Amino acid sequence: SDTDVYTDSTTDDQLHFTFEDNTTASITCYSSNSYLCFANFSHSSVSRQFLGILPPTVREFAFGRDGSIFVNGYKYFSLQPIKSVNFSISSVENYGFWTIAYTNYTDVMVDVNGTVITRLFYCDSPL
Amino acid sequence: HEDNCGWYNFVYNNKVGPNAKYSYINTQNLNIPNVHGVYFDVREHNSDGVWDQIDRVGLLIAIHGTSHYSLLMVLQDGVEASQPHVAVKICHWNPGNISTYHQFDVNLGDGGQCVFNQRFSLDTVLTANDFYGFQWTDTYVDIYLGGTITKVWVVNDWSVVEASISSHWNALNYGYYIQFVNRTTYYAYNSTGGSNYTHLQLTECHTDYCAGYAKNVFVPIDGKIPEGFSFSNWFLLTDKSTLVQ
Amino acid sequence: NFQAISSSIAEIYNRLEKVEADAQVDRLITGRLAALNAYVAQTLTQYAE
Amino acid sequence: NRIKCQQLKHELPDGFYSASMLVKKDLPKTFVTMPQFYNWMNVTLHVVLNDIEKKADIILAGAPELASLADIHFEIAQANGSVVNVTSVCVQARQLALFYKYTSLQGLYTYSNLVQLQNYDCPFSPQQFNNYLQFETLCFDVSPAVAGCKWSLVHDVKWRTQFATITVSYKDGAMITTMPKAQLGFQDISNIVKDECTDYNIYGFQGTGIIRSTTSRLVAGLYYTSASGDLLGFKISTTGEIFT
Amino acid sequence: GCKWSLVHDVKWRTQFATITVSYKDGAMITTMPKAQLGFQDISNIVKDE
Amino acid sequence: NDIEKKADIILAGAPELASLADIHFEIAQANGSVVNVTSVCVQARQLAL
Ligand SMILES: *[C@@H]1O[C@H](CO)[C@@H](O[C@@H]2O[C@H](CO)[C@@H](O[C@@H]3O[C@H](CO[C@H]4O[C@H](CO)[C@@H](O)[C@H](O)[C@@H]4O)[C@@H](O)[C@H](O)[C@@H]3O)[C@H](O)[C@H]2NC(C)=O)[C@H](O)[C@H]1NC(C)=O
Ligand SMILES: *[C@@H]1O[C@H](CO)[C@@H](O[C@@H]2O[C@H](CO)[C@@H](O[C@@H]3O[C@H](CO[C@H]4O[C@H](CO)[C@@H](O)[C@H](O)[C@@H]4O)[C@@H](O)[C@H](O)[C@@H]3O)[C@H](O)[C@H]2NC(C)=O)[C@H](O)[C@H]1NC(C)=O
Ligand SMILES: *[C@@H]1O[C@H](CO)[C@@H](O[C@@H]2O[C@H](CO)[C@@H](O[C@@H]3O[C@H](CO)[C@@H](O)[C@H](O)[C@@H]3O)[C@H](O)[C@H]2NC(C)=O)[C@H](O)[C@H]1NC(C)=O
Ligand SMILES: *[C@@H]1O[C@H](CO)[C@@H](O[C@@H]2O[C@H](CO)[C@@H](O)[C@H](O)[C@H]2NC(C)=O)[C@H](O)[C@H]1NC(C)=O
Ligand SMILES: *[C@@H]1O[C@H](CO)[C@@H](O[C@@H]2O[C@H](CO)[C@@H](O)[C@H](O)[C@H]2NC(C)=O)[C@H](O)[C@H]1NC(C)=O
Ligand SMILES: *[C@@H]1O[C@H](CO)[C@@H](O[C@@H]2O[C@H](CO)[C@@H](O)[C@H](O)[C@H]2NC(C)=O)[C@H](O)[C@H]1NC(C)=O
Ligand SMILES: *[C@@H]1O[C@H](CO)[C@@H](O)[C@H](O)[C@H]1NC(C)=O
Ligand SMILES: *[C@@H]1O[C@H](CO)[C@@H](O)[C@H](O)[C@H]1NC(C)=O
Ligand SMILES: *[C@@H]1O[C@H](CO)[C@@H](O)[C@H](O)[C@H]1NC(C)=O
Ligand SMILES: *[C@@H]1O[C@H](CO)[C@@H](O)[C@H](O)[C@H]1NC(C)=O
Ligand SMILES: *[C@@H]1O[C@H](CO)[C@@H](O)[C@H](O)[C@H]1NC(C)=O
Ligand SMILES: *[C@@H]1O[C@H](CO)[C@@H](O)[C@H](O)[C@H]1NC(C)=O
Ligand SMILES: *[C@@H]1O[C@H](CO)[C@@H](O)[C@H](O)[C@H]1NC(C)=O
């Protein structure tokens, strides 16, 4: 929910994908706070396709390989098999760091209380 | 300069800070002051510094690399008025230089390549000295005006800051500090329960990656998130419906 | 959905007409009525025990 | 008396009897989906029957004989002025509606020669199709093409002999949503109706109930189900408020 | 019999024409993936694992 | 067929690809090359698709 100015005048991306076999998608966003976000499936911004509205308090992006784009948990829209991600975004804290994980699927238990994860537990040992 | 850093403790770090939390703040900021009345402060470095002034005299800062051809520059005036206001512009000019001594509402160039403009209200709420500077990295321009931090994404090929005071006073004194930062300093915020200096316990660090210990960074010891960890930012990923309990 | 379209009844009446939606919702009724008798007989086990 | 009719007894023993009320008949509708820029189509099915060679003995006509007198086409409406006819449109847009309009050539709109649609295999009848149904893909056809499920097309509404099917091809999804009455202009779909018993259609979930507004914020997905697949709450996307 | 579909856009699966197959269950016809030729015996009993 | 409809085949409608379609079963003869048919129906013992 970093809401700043985007004075590109270069038709910038703010999020750029590379699909399998050299195909480019480039999505951008704005604000109103709702999130107007459009797309391009081209080399330049030849048109615009309306994705949706992201809710005002975004605090997790998630890019699956097949094309899933999770936001806050929910799957908002699918896409193509992703090869690489070219990104430029920030956060409203100016304090510490983010985390960008590289992650595999694994069966676990979760503790949910008020729709947020309380305590995680793994399933790897036979016990 | 303990009190002056102690004033820097109060006003500058009251930008954002929530309660009961500590982090590892790294912003290229002050270490040792400078007072300058040369009125053409042509200095070339690698990031901005911060100025400081209480009296009612207009200011002007210009930020550029070399004189480019489409790479936009920064223009800014801090002028005293009924309310002391400040306008920042992002545009471009070939002609001119700041040996000026005029009045400066909007006075440097009508560049035909201009995209960003905003007239900010400087919050002169405190009677003590309050700091106002800027920062850029490579694509990423910072504003520290008044009560917030605002970000501009353009491009930064920037190494020449131009600062000047445009008035010929005969003989006046100015309580007036301005620095120019070309460094990579680090700090360590605290605010555990309140050390009552004002609310916190600062710590500058010497070299690298100090006792700040941001809880977001962990060590994936087995491929496994460590137990006893705030999941304020990790979610259950699904597509059908979320849980509640 | 006991061999029917969907597991909610108001979904069924907003796709089909009443002359043919009744056959689909009939499998919901007889399926769910058996689900009560599975519960009731388990309960009367415990009341007598 | 409703307790007595549920008890099959003219006299009840005194005690506790679970009773409720028949709810209502007319309820104001309510339809909430993810906001999208409107792109609404208007395709109509149009059947014209030749009645100029076979004046008043069309009720004696055999089944393939009406196929020569048939005229089946999809009048897809252009947004410029008039309409265009095709054989098998298959939709790429976001909102659409199927309308039906049969015309005899010489005022023959009596019971003994009609045409009306008939659900034969599809899990949705054609006269319910303009409700808020949700698909991923949807493509129509009039020929014996690629088989999805097929709709019938009957002549005598007493003696329902068939001409030719309208097969549809589809799979479930959320990109295509049917609309009955062309919500144009708005880049937001609406009619949250609060504090009364409504009929909702929320993100594909469906049913009747009372919707309120609350002051509690959950950082999660769109909606919140029970253990039985019923709606308990949902989040508007354009703002942050959630409903119950 | 039953029919297989044949789709164009693997995002937007519009169909051309089906490949219907006709069949009934039995043991005279067995599909093989990789053409076991030459042998008059089919094999690969794999023991103790 | 991609020779009349260079790079706008993604805008082609559903029956339009049916004219550009070419569906056949290349049944392999055991002598050398392959033969194309429209609808083979197998009499042999092992086969693969
Ligand atoms: C997390 O999950 C990922 C799955 O999405 C895991 O990625 C898999 O990683 C394994 C090991 O690197 C890959 O398997 C290897 O693939 C190479 C190349 O494959 C080709 O050749 C093999 C036969 O040699 C053939 O079976 C394949 O079909 C290809 O023809 C092989 O040389 C290796 O022998 C081995 O098969 C998986 O392919 C890969 N997933 C995919 C489909 O890319 C990742 O390892 C996981 N990380 C964890 C659990 O730590
Ligand atoms: C979906 O598309 C349908 C096909 O066009 C739409 O039906 C059209 O609705 C408009 C509403 O304005 C009609 O225009 C009116 O026509 C009547 C007289 O109708 C008769 O004469 C016209 C002469 O042009 C003829 O075209 C008709 O077929 C009738 O013979 C006028 O009295 C009104 O003032 C007005 O002009 C169209 O006539 C009508 N077309 C057809 C073929 O029915 C339908 O509204 C669309 N639905 C939507 C957008 O939800
Ligand atoms: C950006 O900042 C860095 C360091 O903060 C600049 O380094 C400057 O480096 C020179 C050495 O090349 C330092 O000068 C030294 O000065 C002493 C005193 O006369 C002299 O005895 C040594 O032999 C040497 O000359 C200089 O102090 C240091 N300056 C600063 C700003 O700390 C770097 O030059 C800066 N970027 C610029 C302006 O190019
Ligand atoms: C985790 O769940 C428990 C159980 O619902 C929550 O405990 C409730 O907390 C509120 C405020 O602290 C009290 O008013 C309730 O009475 C508590 N419930 C019970 C049964 O005593 C707890 O708040 C949840 N944790 C969260 C939301 O962070
Ligand atoms: C504008 O004028 C100032 C002041 O004359 C120039 O600043 C000088 O820059 C040179 C080269 O970097 C230094 O050696 C001098 O010490 C600076 N100050 C003075 C007083 O000369 C500045 O370069 C000029 N900018 C132009 C002409 O574009
Ligand atoms: C900030 O200062 C506080 C004390 O004013 C530190 O709190 C102590 O932290 C250590 C571990 O680092 C604990 O063992 C002590 O019990 C804490 N004291 C209290 C008051 O409980 C705090 O750690 C400092 N900041 C950080 C994160 O190092
Ligand atoms: C580019 O795409 C082609 C096919 O689209 C692929 O074979 C190749 O690996 C891609 N990457 C390159 C050339 O780096
Ligand atoms: C992707 O990132 C690389 C490295 O930052 C950059 O050179 C390239 O231009 C980017 N691609 C885009 C913006 O399409
Ligand atoms: C710290 O001391 C100051 C006195 O200047 C007091 O106002 C403040 O409330 C104290 N904070 C705590 C947490 O006790
Ligand atoms: C709409 O445009 C089509 C051509 O694309 C034209 O044939 C038709 O007459 C137009 N209709 C009106 C009334 O504008
Ligand atoms: C549309 O109607 C015209 C006029 O009768 C007819 O000639 C044409 O064949 C029709 N087109 C289709 C695709 O049915
Ligand atoms: C196989 O035999 C057929 C005739 O039965 C002949 O047409 C074909 O060319 C032969 N192929 C080879 C390569 O022997
Ligand atoms: C086999 O291919 C030839 C060459 O294109 C063609 O002429 C012939 O019609 C095909 N036969 C069948 C049965 O498809």
Coordinates of C-alpha atoms in Angstrom, one line a residue, chain B residues 37-216:
Chain B
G37 CA 27.3 31.9 3.7
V38 CA 29.2 31.7 0.4
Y39 CA 25.9 32.1 -1.5
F40 CA 27.1 29.9 -4.4
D41 CA 27.6 26.5 -2.7
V42 CA 28.7 24.6 -5.8
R43 CA 29.5 21.1 -4.3
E44 CA 29.5 17.8 -6.2
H45 CA 29.0 14.6 -4.2
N46 CA 26.9 11.4 -4.4
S47 CA 23.7 12.1 -2.4
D48 CA 21.9 15.0 -0.8
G49 CA 22.4 16.4 2.6
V50 CA 20.0 18.2 5.0
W51 CA 19.7 21.9 5.7
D52 CA 18.5 23.6 8.8
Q53 CA 17.4 27.3 9.4
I54 CA 15.0 29.2 11.6
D55 CA 15.2 32.7 10.2
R56 CA 13.0 34.2 7.4
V57 CA 15.3 34.0 4.3
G58 CA 14.5 32.4 1.0
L59 CA 16.4 29.3 -0.1
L60 CA 16.9 27.4 -3.4
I61 CA 18.3 23.9 -4.1
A62 CA 19.0 22.5 -7.6
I63 CA 19.9 18.8 -8.2
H64 CA 21.4 17.5 -11.4
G65 CA 24.1 15.3 -12.8
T66 CA 25.8 16.9 -15.7
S67 CA 23.7 19.2 -18.0
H68 CA 21.8 16.4 -19.8
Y69 CA 19.3 16.7 -22.6
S70 CA 16.3 14.7 -21.4
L71 CA 17.3 13.5 -18.0
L72 CA 15.2 15.6 -15.7
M73 CA 16.6 17.7 -12.9
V74 CA 15.2 18.9 -9.6
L75 CA 14.2 22.5 -8.8
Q76 CA 13.1 23.7 -5.4
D77 CA 12.6 26.9 -3.5
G78 CA 12.1 27.4 0.2
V79 CA 10.5 30.9 0.4
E80 CA 9.2 32.8 3.4
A81 CA 5.6 34.0 3.1
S82 CA 2.4 34.3 5.2
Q83 CA 2.9 30.6 5.5
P84 CA 6.5 29.5 4.6
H85 CA 5.8 27.3 1.6
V86 CA 8.0 25.1 -0.7
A87 CA 7.5 24.0 -4.3
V88 CA 9.5 21.2 -5.9
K89 CA 9.6 20.7 -9.6
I90 CA 11.0 18.0 -11.9
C91 CA 12.0 19.5 -15.2
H92 CA 14.9 20.4 -17.4
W93 CA 16.9 23.4 -18.6
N94 CA 20.0 24.2 -20.7
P95 CA 20.5 28.0 -20.0
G96 CA 21.4 29.7 -16.9
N97 CA 23.1 29.4 -13.5
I98 CA 22.4 30.5 -9.9
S99 CA 24.1 33.8 -9.5
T100 CA 20.7 35.4 -9.4
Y101 CA 19.6 37.5 -6.3
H102 CA 15.9 37.9 -7.3
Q103 CA 12.5 37.0 -5.8
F104 CA 11.7 33.3 -6.3
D105 CA 8.1 32.2 -6.2
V106 CA 8.5 30.1 -9.4
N107 CA 11.8 31.4 -10.9
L108 CA 14.2 29.0 -12.7
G109 CA 13.3 28.2 -16.3
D110 CA 10.2 27.4 -18.2
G111 CA 11.4 24.0 -19.4
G112 CA 9.1 22.4 -21.9
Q113 CA 9.9 18.9 -20.5
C114 CA 8.3 19.0 -17.1
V115 CA 6.2 16.3 -15.4
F116 CA 6.2 16.6 -11.6
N117 CA 5.3 19.7 -9.6
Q118 CA 3.9 20.1 -6.1
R119 CA 3.7 23.0 -3.6
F120 CA 4.3 21.6 -0.1
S121 CA 3.5 23.3 3.1
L122 CA 6.4 23.3 5.5
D123 CA 5.2 22.4 9.0
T124 CA 7.1 24.8 11.2
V125 CA 5.3 23.5 14.2
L126 CA 8.2 23.3 16.6
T127 CA 10.2 26.4 17.7
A128 CA 13.5 24.5 17.7
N129 CA 15.6 23.4 14.8
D130 CA 14.0 20.9 12.5
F131 CA 15.7 19.1 9.6
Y132 CA 14.6 18.9 6.0
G133 CA 16.7 17.1 3.4
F134 CA 16.4 14.7 0.4
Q135 CA 17.7 11.5 -1.0
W136 CA 18.0 9.7 -4.3
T137 CA 19.5 6.4 -5.2
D138 CA 19.2 5.5 -8.9
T139 CA 15.5 5.6 -9.8
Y140 CA 14.0 6.7 -6.6
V141 CA 13.7 10.3 -5.2
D142 CA 12.8 11.1 -1.6
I143 CA 11.1 14.1 -0.1
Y144 CA 11.3 15.0 3.6
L145 CA 9.0 18.0 3.7
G146 CA 7.1 18.8 6.8
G147 CA 5.4 15.7 8.2
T148 CA 5.8 12.9 5.7
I149 CA 8.0 11.1 3.2
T150 CA 7.0 11.2 -0.5
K151 CA 8.6 9.2 -3.3
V152 CA 9.2 10.0 -6.9
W153 CA 10.2 7.3 -9.4
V154 CA 12.0 8.8 -12.4
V155 CA 15.8 8.0 -12.9
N156 CA 18.8 9.4 -10.9
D157 CA 22.0 10.0 -12.8
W158 CA 22.7 12.7 -10.2
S159 CA 26.0 13.9 -8.7
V160 CA 25.9 17.7 -8.6
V161 CA 23.8 19.6 -6.0
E162 CA 23.4 23.3 -6.4
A163 CA 22.6 25.3 -3.3
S164 CA 22.5 29.1 -2.9
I165 CA 21.1 32.0 -0.9
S166 CA 19.9 34.8 -3.1
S167 CA 20.0 38.1 -1.1
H168 CA 22.8 40.6 -0.4
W169 CA 22.5 41.3 3.2
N170 CA 25.1 43.8 4.5
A171 CA 26.1 42.1 7.7
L172 CA 23.8 39.6 9.3
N173 CA 24.2 36.4 11.4
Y174 CA 22.4 33.2 10.4
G175 CA 21.8 30.4 12.7
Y176 CA 22.0 28.1 9.7
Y177 CA 23.2 24.6 9.2
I178 CA 23.5 22.6 6.0
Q179 CA 25.3 19.4 5.3
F180 CA 26.0 17.3 2.2
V181 CA 25.9 13.5 2.7
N182 CA 28.2 11.1 0.6
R183 CA 28.3 8.2 3.0
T184 CA 26.6 4.9 3.9
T185 CA 25.9 5.4 7.6
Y186 CA 23.8 3.0 9.7
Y187 CA 21.9 3.3 12.9
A188 CA 20.0 1.2 15.4
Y189 CA 16.5 2.3 16.7
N190 CA 15.2 0.9 20.0
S191 CA 11.9 2.2 21.7
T192 CA 11.6 -1.1 23.8
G193 CA 9.6 0.5 26.7
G194 CA 11.0 4.1 26.5
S195 CA 14.4 5.1 27.7
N196 CA 13.0 8.6 28.5
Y197 CA 15.6 10.5 26.5
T198 CA 12.5 11.3 24.6
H199 CA 11.2 7.8 24.0
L200 CA 14.1 5.7 22.8
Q201 CA 17.7 4.5 22.8
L202 CA 19.6 5.3 19.7
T203 CA 22.9 3.6 18.7
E204 CA 25.1 4.5 15.8
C205 CA 27.1 1.5 14.6
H206 CA 30.6 1.4 13.2
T207 CA 30.8 -0.9 10.2
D208 CA 28.0 -3.4 9.2
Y209 CA 24.8 -5.2 10.3
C210 CA 24.7 -4.3 13.9
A211 CA 22.6 -5.3 17.0
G212 CA 19.4 -4.2 15.4
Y213 CA 18.1 -7.7 14.6
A214 CA 15.1 -7.2 12.3
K215 CA 12.8 -10.0 13.0
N216 CA 11.8 -10.3 9.3

